């Protein structure tokens, strides 16, 4: 994994601790192995602000770009231009389309996240009732994939007494996510569960439910940082979130860095059925990963399974991320 190349990571947006942990993990591995890492945080979680960052990376003459896409398709011209300049493009966290990358590094199976969330809603609701999604940007590939996944999973007869009222967008912004939580509550006060598959959205919704005194009546699940959600997690009337899920964003960054170095050094090309082993034997199968065909027609590397954070384990993990 020795490298002397320069690697740009472009996260979704500024002002999001999840993205900072991702970029930290990426930088740590790149630098440990001799490369240079340049991190960019788009001003907002939009395609427009990301394109500006892609263009900056190209201008700096970097060797590799790793990107968490704010839109599945809008980045394609800039990323193609990067490729035309000889830059390896990798995607992580939120996928660019298959034509815009050599490989996607996915935190967990898309289906695994959808299934965990649907089963959580079914459990936490008591088996029936109205629920809503508080998403991030309406264009974000990952939330859209999870939401599509949930909608597929929820067709199963076991979920037939649940009713999804709709999808609201908090844009991965605290204030917007608080405002949309209030909008959800106003639209359906009898809602049983809010599912927020965004670390920003879930902690914003938690804050709103706590402030309104609703933790005993409206429950909350989703995808959140243990560090942010620790005080909201509990199985009683005083905590809105009985449990939620995530994965290690630092390790997501780590793996994306190992894969980036592997692309630059030519150890992999992104093609299905290729394998690589990273120094870190806690990832994969004793460090080993295989590239698999992805549903979007590209290829992907899957970091691990989702991890459930609940009262029995939340405090220890809150110090990790
Ligand atoms: C769950 C998590 O939530 C936010 O931090 C971002 O939208 C990120 O892309 C997503 O993976």
Short mmCIF file of C-alpha atoms and ligand atoms in Angstrom, two decimals:
data_model
loop_
_atom_site.label_atom_id
_atom_site.label_comp_id
_atom_site.label_asym_id
_atom_site.label_seq_id
_atom_site.Cartn_x
_atom_site.Cartn_y
_atom_site.Cartn_z
CA UNK A 1 0.00 0.00 0.00
CA UNK A 2 2.95 2.39 -0.15
CA UNK A 3 1.97 5.40 -2.27
CA UNK A 4 3.24 8.87 -3.03
CA UNK A 5 0.12 10.00 -4.86
CA UNK A 6 -2.36 12.73 -4.02
CA UNK A 7 -5.92 11.77 -3.11
CA UNK A 8 -8.92 14.14 -2.90
CA UNK A 9 -11.91 13.16 -0.81
CA UNK A 10 -15.03 15.18 -1.46
CA UNK A 11 -17.64 14.51 1.18
CA UNK A 12 -21.32 15.44 0.80
CA UNK A 13 -21.17 18.64 2.84
CA UNK A 14 -19.76 20.84 5.58
CA UNK A 15 -21.26 20.98 9.04
CA UNK A 16 -21.81 17.22 9.40
CA UNK A 17 -19.75 15.27 11.94
CA UNK A 18 -20.39 12.00 10.10
CA UNK A 19 -18.61 13.43 7.06
CA UNK A 20 -15.69 14.62 9.17
CA UNK A 21 -15.20 11.14 10.63
CA UNK A 22 -15.33 9.67 7.13
CA UNK A 23 -12.74 12.11 5.84
CA UNK A 24 -10.55 11.56 8.95
CA UNK A 25 -10.45 7.82 8.31
CA UNK A 26 -9.65 8.39 4.64
CA UNK A 27 -6.86 10.87 5.38
CA UNK A 28 -5.41 8.67 8.12
CA UNK A 29 -4.83 5.72 5.79
CA UNK A 30 -3.67 7.79 2.82
CA UNK A 31 -1.09 9.63 4.93
CA UNK A 32 0.03 6.54 6.85
CA UNK A 33 1.03 5.01 3.55
CA UNK A 34 2.85 8.06 2.22
CA UNK A 35 0.22 9.82 0.14
CA UNK A 36 -1.15 13.33 0.36
CA UNK A 37 -4.81 13.81 1.20
CA UNK A 38 -6.89 16.86 0.36
CA UNK A 39 -10.33 17.06 1.99
CA UNK A 40 -13.13 19.19 0.62
CA UNK A 41 -16.45 19.94 2.27
CA UNK A 42 -19.10 21.35 -0.10
CA UNK A 43 -20.87 24.40 1.37
CA UNK A 44 -24.19 22.60 1.04
CA UNK A 45 -25.25 19.05 0.16
CA UNK A 46 -25.96 19.89 -3.47
CA UNK A 47 -24.59 18.86 -6.85
CA UNK A 48 -23.66 22.46 -7.69
CA UNK A 49 -21.40 22.91 -4.65
CA UNK A 50 -19.80 19.53 -5.28
CA UNK A 51 -18.97 20.26 -8.88
CA UNK A 52 -17.03 23.29 -7.68
CA UNK A 53 -14.99 20.93 -5.46
CA UNK A 54 -14.44 18.41 -8.25
CA UNK A 55 -13.19 21.19 -10.44
CA UNK A 56 -10.82 22.36 -7.69
CA UNK A 57 -9.45 18.83 -7.33
CA UNK A 58 -8.83 18.55 -11.07
CA UNK A 59 -7.15 21.97 -11.03
CA UNK A 60 -4.81 20.79 -8.27
CA UNK A 61 -3.78 17.83 -10.42
CA UNK A 62 -4.69 15.13 -7.92
CA UNK A 63 -4.26 11.46 -8.81
CA UNK A 64 -7.49 10.15 -7.30
CA UNK A 65 -10.90 11.51 -6.32
CA UNK A 66 -13.11 9.73 -3.79
CA UNK A 67 -16.59 11.22 -3.75
CA UNK A 68 -19.79 10.89 -1.71
CA UNK A 69 -22.34 12.00 -4.27
CA UNK A 70 -25.01 14.61 -3.67
CA UNK A 71 -26.68 13.57 -6.92
CA UNK A 72 -26.39 10.33 -8.81
CA UNK A 73 -26.08 11.83 -12.30
CA UNK A 74 -25.29 15.57 -12.14
CA UNK A 75 -21.62 14.98 -11.31
CA UNK A 76 -21.01 12.88 -14.40
CA UNK A 77 -19.59 15.58 -16.67
CA UNK A 78 -17.08 16.86 -14.11
CA UNK A 79 -16.07 13.35 -13.05
CA UNK A 80 -15.73 12.27 -16.66
CA UNK A 81 -13.45 15.29 -17.21
CA UNK A 82 -11.43 14.09 -14.21
CA UNK A 83 -11.19 10.66 -15.79
CA UNK A 84 -10.14 12.24 -19.10
CA UNK A 85 -7.23 13.90 -17.23
CA UNK A 86 -6.12 10.49 -15.94
CA UNK A 87 -7.69 10.79 -12.49
CA UNK A 88 -8.98 7.64 -10.79
CA UNK A 89 -12.53 8.20 -9.58
CA UNK A 90 -13.89 6.19 -6.65
CA UNK A 91 -17.17 6.78 -4.83
CA UNK A 92 -18.06 6.15 -1.17
CA UNK A 93 -21.04 6.62 1.20
CA UNK A 94 -23.34 7.86 -1.56
CA UNK A 95 -22.84 6.54 -5.08
CA UNK A 96 -22.22 8.43 -8.27
CA UNK A 97 -23.67 6.54 -11.20
CA UNK A 98 -21.82 3.55 -12.74
CA UNK A 99 -20.40 5.62 -15.61
CA UNK A 100 -18.89 8.14 -13.21
CA UNK A 101 -16.69 5.81 -11.13
CA UNK A 102 -14.45 2.75 -11.13
CA UNK A 103 -16.05 1.37 -7.94
CA UNK A 104 -18.40 2.29 -5.06
CA UNK A 105 -17.48 1.72 -1.43
CA UNK A 106 -20.75 0.99 0.38
CA UNK A 107 -21.06 1.12 4.19
CA UNK A 108 -23.48 -1.81 4.21
CA UNK A 109 -25.73 -3.71 1.85
CA UNK A 110 -28.51 -1.36 0.70
CA UNK A 111 -31.03 -4.10 1.45
CA UNK A 112 -29.55 -4.77 4.86
CA UNK A 113 -30.13 -1.15 5.89
CA UNK A 114 -33.68 -1.14 4.49
CA UNK A 115 -34.57 -4.40 6.19
CA UNK A 116 -33.13 -3.32 9.55
CA UNK A 117 -35.11 -0.10 9.40
CA UNK A 118 -38.40 -1.70 8.37
CA UNK A 119 -38.11 -4.28 11.15
CA UNK A 120 -37.31 -1.46 13.57
CA UNK A 121 -40.40 0.47 12.53
CA UNK A 122 -42.56 -2.64 12.82
CA UNK A 123 -41.22 -3.34 16.32
CA UNK A 124 -41.20 0.18 17.69
CA UNK A 125 -44.68 1.04 16.33
CA UNK A 126 -46.15 -1.99 18.08
CA UNK A 127 -46.97 -3.57 14.73
CA UNK A 128 -49.25 -0.97 13.13
CA UNK A 129 -49.65 2.72 12.51
CA UNK A 130 -48.47 5.69 10.53
CA UNK A 131 -44.82 6.47 10.00
CA UNK A 132 -42.77 8.94 8.00
CA UNK A 133 -39.29 9.28 6.53
CA UNK A 134 -37.15 12.31 7.30
CA UNK A 135 -34.47 12.09 4.64
CA UNK A 136 -31.48 14.24 3.71
CA UNK A 137 -31.22 15.88 0.25
CA UNK A 138 -33.89 14.70 -2.19
CA UNK A 139 -31.10 13.96 -4.69
CA UNK A 140 -28.84 11.98 -2.34
CA UNK A 141 -28.14 8.61 -3.85
CA UNK A 142 -27.77 6.75 -0.59
CA UNK A 143 -30.95 7.92 1.14
CA UNK A 144 -32.85 7.43 -2.07
CA UNK A 145 -31.54 3.84 -2.32
CA UNK A 146 -32.42 3.10 1.30
CA UNK A 147 -35.87 4.61 0.87
CA UNK A 148 -36.46 2.62 -2.30
CA UNK A 149 -35.24 -0.43 -0.42
CA UNK A 150 -37.67 0.24 2.43
CA UNK A 151 -40.54 0.63 0.00
CA UNK A 152 -39.70 -2.73 -1.54
CA UNK A 153 -39.29 -4.47 1.83
CA UNK A 154 -42.50 -3.00 3.21
CA UNK A 155 -44.63 -4.81 0.59
CA UNK A 156 -44.23 -7.96 2.67
CA UNK A 157 -47.49 -8.94 4.38
CA UNK A 158 -45.80 -8.64 7.80
CA UNK A 159 -45.80 -4.84 7.35
CA UNK A 160 -49.36 -4.57 6.07
CA UNK A 161 -50.70 -2.60 9.08
CA UNK A 162 -48.01 0.08 8.77
CA UNK A 163 -48.71 3.15 6.66
CA UNK A 164 -45.93 5.29 5.20
CA UNK A 165 -47.30 8.84 5.05
CA UNK A 166 -44.47 10.15 2.93
CA UNK A 167 -40.92 11.35 2.60
CA UNK A 168 -39.70 14.70 3.92
CA UNK A 169 -36.31 16.28 3.13
CA UNK A 170 -34.06 17.89 5.73
CA UNK A 171 -31.08 18.34 3.36
CA UNK A 172 -28.53 17.13 5.90
CA UNK A 173 -28.97 20.48 7.66
CA UNK A 174 -29.84 20.80 11.34
CA UNK A 175 -32.34 23.66 11.08
CA UNK A 176 -34.08 22.34 7.97
CA UNK A 177 -34.31 18.92 9.60
CA UNK A 178 -35.85 20.40 12.77
CA UNK A 179 -38.33 22.34 10.65
CA UNK A 180 -39.30 19.23 8.66
CA UNK A 181 -39.77 17.25 11.88
CA UNK A 182 -42.29 19.91 12.99
CA UNK A 183 -43.92 19.64 9.55
CA UNK A 184 -44.22 15.86 9.91
CA UNK A 185 -45.86 16.28 13.33
CA UNK A 186 -48.30 18.93 12.06
CA UNK A 187 -49.27 16.81 9.05
CA UNK A 188 -49.94 13.71 11.12
CA UNK A 189 -50.01 14.20 14.90
CA UNK A 190 -50.96 10.50 15.30
CA UNK A 191 -47.71 9.38 13.74
CA UNK A 192 -46.11 6.49 15.62
CA UNK A 193 -42.56 6.46 14.23
CA UNK A 194 -40.23 8.82 12.41
CA UNK A 195 -37.52 7.02 10.46
CA UNK A 196 -34.59 9.35 9.78
CA UNK A 197 -31.91 7.62 7.62
CA UNK A 198 -29.48 10.52 8.02
CA UNK A 199 -27.24 11.26 10.98
CA UNK A 200 -28.14 14.95 10.84
CA UNK A 201 -31.86 14.34 10.47
CA UNK A 202 -32.14 11.82 13.27
CA UNK A 203 -30.42 14.01 15.83
CA UNK A 204 -32.48 17.02 14.76
CA UNK A 205 -35.71 15.03 15.04
CA UNK A 206 -34.61 13.77 18.46
CA UNK A 207 -34.08 17.33 19.64
CA UNK A 208 -37.52 18.39 18.41
CA UNK A 209 -39.31 15.39 19.97
CA UNK A 210 -37.54 16.05 23.28
CA UNK A 211 -38.34 19.77 23.23
CA UNK A 212 -42.02 19.06 22.49
CA UNK A 213 -42.32 16.45 25.21
CA UNK A 214 -43.27 13.74 22.70
CA UNK A 215 -40.68 11.03 23.45
CA UNK A 216 -43.28 8.80 25.04
CA UNK A 217 -45.71 9.09 22.09
CA UNK A 218 -43.69 9.43 18.89
CA UNK A 219 -40.73 7.16 18.55
CA UNK A 220 -37.67 7.65 16.41
CA UNK A 221 -35.27 5.38 14.56
CA UNK A 222 -32.89 5.68 11.63
CA UNK A 223 -29.19 6.05 10.91
CA UNK A 224 -27.32 8.05 13.53
CA UNK A 225 -23.99 8.71 15.25
CA UNK A 226 -23.73 7.08 18.68
CA UNK A 227 -21.95 10.24 19.95
CA UNK A 228 -24.93 12.45 19.01
CA UNK A 229 -27.76 10.06 19.85
CA UNK A 230 -26.52 8.64 23.17
CA UNK A 231 -28.73 10.83 25.37
CA UNK A 232 -31.84 10.13 23.25
CA UNK A 233 -31.60 6.38 23.29
CA UNK A 234 -33.64 4.46 25.83
CA UNK A 235 -36.47 1.96 26.16
CA UNK A 236 -38.84 4.10 28.23
CA UNK A 237 -41.24 7.04 27.98
CA UNK A 238 -38.49 9.61 28.34
CA UNK A 239 -36.41 8.68 25.27
CA UNK A 240 -37.67 8.83 21.71
CA UNK A 241 -35.23 6.32 20.21
CA UNK A 242 -35.28 2.70 21.39
CA UNK A 243 -32.51 1.85 18.94
CA UNK A 244 -31.00 2.83 15.63
CA UNK A 245 -28.29 1.66 13.22
CA UNK A 246 -25.08 2.74 11.60
CA UNK A 247 -21.58 1.46 10.76
CA UNK A 248 -18.12 2.88 11.41
CA UNK A 249 -17.67 6.01 9.28
CA UNK A 250 -13.96 6.12 10.07
CA UNK A 251 -13.53 2.59 8.74
CA UNK A 252 -15.68 3.49 5.72
CA UNK A 253 -13.09 6.17 5.09
CA UNK A 254 -10.25 3.74 5.81
CA UNK A 255 -11.54 1.18 3.30
CA UNK A 256 -12.18 3.80 0.64
CA UNK A 257 -8.57 4.91 1.12
CA UNK A 258 -7.21 1.36 0.77
CA UNK A 259 -9.30 0.91 -2.37
CA UNK A 260 -8.16 4.27 -3.73
CA UNK A 261 -4.50 3.32 -3.24
CA UNK A 262 -5.25 -0.02 -4.91
CA UNK A 263 -6.66 1.75 -7.97
CA UNK A 264 -3.65 4.09 -8.16
CA UNK A 265 -1.15 1.25 -7.74
CA UNK A 266 -3.10 -0.90 -10.21
CA UNK A 267 -3.73 -3.75 -7.75
CA UNK A 268 -7.43 -3.49 -8.66
CA UNK A 269 -9.33 -1.74 -11.43
CA UNK A 270 -12.83 -1.88 -9.94
CA UNK A 271 -13.98 -4.88 -11.95
CA UNK A 272 -16.25 -7.46 -10.35
CA UNK A 273 -14.60 -10.53 -8.81
CA UNK A 274 -11.34 -8.76 -8.04
CA UNK A 275 -10.03 -9.10 -4.51
CA UNK A 276 -7.71 -7.17 -2.27
CA UNK A 277 -6.49 -7.57 1.28
CA UNK A 278 -5.93 -4.51 3.43
CA UNK A 279 -3.38 -4.34 6.31
CA UNK A 280 -6.31 -3.98 8.65
CA UNK A 281 -7.52 -7.52 9.38
CA UNK A 282 -10.64 -6.33 11.22
CA UNK A 283 -12.12 -5.25 7.89
CA UNK A 284 -13.65 -7.82 5.54
CA UNK A 285 -12.68 -11.47 5.75
CA UNK A 286 -9.43 -11.14 7.70
CA UNK A 287 -8.66 -8.00 5.69
CA UNK A 288 -9.98 -9.49 2.46
CA UNK A 289 -12.67 -7.96 0.23
CA UNK A 290 -14.20 -8.92 -3.10
CA UNK A 291 -15.68 -6.49 -5.61
CA UNK A 292 -19.24 -7.41 -6.47
CA UNK A 293 -21.75 -6.39 -9.12
CA UNK A 294 -23.94 -3.55 -7.86
CA UNK A 295 -27.66 -3.04 -8.46
CA UNK A 296 -27.00 0.28 -10.22
CA UNK A 297 -25.02 -1.58 -12.90
CA UNK A 298 -21.65 -0.63 -11.50
CA UNK A 299 -19.51 -2.44 -8.99
CA UNK A 300 -19.15 -2.03 -5.27
CA UNK A 301 -17.21 -3.10 -2.20
CA UNK A 302 -19.35 -3.58 0.91
CA UNK A 303 -17.69 -2.52 4.17
CA UNK A 304 -19.72 -4.67 6.54
CA UNK A 305 -23.20 -5.27 7.95
CA UNK A 306 -25.21 -2.57 9.64
CA UNK A 307 -24.68 -2.35 13.40
CA UNK A 308 -27.51 -1.90 15.88
CA UNK A 309 -27.02 0.73 18.61
CA UNK A 310 -29.32 0.23 21.56
CA UNK A 311 -29.36 0.85 25.32
CA UNK A 312 -27.21 -2.21 25.99
CA UNK A 313 -24.26 -0.88 23.91
CA UNK A 314 -24.76 2.81 23.14
CA UNK A 315 -22.51 4.44 25.74
CA UNK A 316 -19.33 2.53 24.83
CA UNK A 317 -19.73 3.36 21.13
CA UNK A 318 -20.52 7.03 21.76
CA UNK A 319 -16.82 7.56 22.42
CA UNK A 320 -15.83 6.03 19.07
CA UNK A 321 -17.96 8.08 16.65
C1 LIG B 1 -26.47 8.10 7.35
C2 LIG B 1 -25.58 9.24 6.88
O1 LIG B 1 -26.24 10.44 7.16
C3 LIG B 1 -25.56 11.63 6.81
O2 LIG B 1 -24.43 11.72 7.61
C4 LIG B 1 -25.13 11.64 5.35
O3 LIG B 1 -26.29 11.86 4.61
C5 LIG B 1 -24.44 10.34 4.94
O4 LIG B 1 -24.27 10.38 3.52
C6 LIG B 1 -25.25 9.12 5.39
O5 LIG B 1 -24.51 7.94 5.14
#
